[PDB]
């Protein structure tokens, strides 16, 4: 896992951000807008989907 770890960074694919990271960027008053996308998966306060 140490010697192989440069070989992940030779394939030049744009790794997409996860849904939690795409959820983190919103400001407080923008988290309650229809322009938000990831509100469909914020179901439970104590879990994540």
């Amino acid at each position: 896992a140490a010697r192989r770890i440069p070989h992940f960074y030779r394939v030049r694919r744009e790794v997409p951000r996860t849904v939690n990271e795409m959820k983190q960027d919103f400001v407080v008053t923008d988290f309650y807008k229809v322009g938000n996308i990831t509100l469909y998966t914020e179901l439970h306060p104590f879990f994540d989907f």
């Binding site: 744009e14 951000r17 990271e21 960027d25």
Partner: protein, 49 residues
């Protein structure tokens, strides 16, 4: 750091980075007035001597 907008800068909108579409301090089309090494990404701009 204060002019990068480090909150919501992610991904590759076009072949230029996202903060290059934000502030003049990030895109390689603006040049500093005094220079000693022209950068690697000259291919966008054109130069005349």
């Amino acid at each position: 750091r204060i002019s990068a907008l480090p909150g919501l800068n992610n991904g590759q909108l076009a072949e230029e980075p996202l903060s290059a579409y934000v502030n003049a301090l990030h895109d390689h089309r603006l040049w500093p007035p005094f220079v000693t090494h022209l950068p690697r990404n000259m291919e966008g701009v054109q130069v005349v001597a």
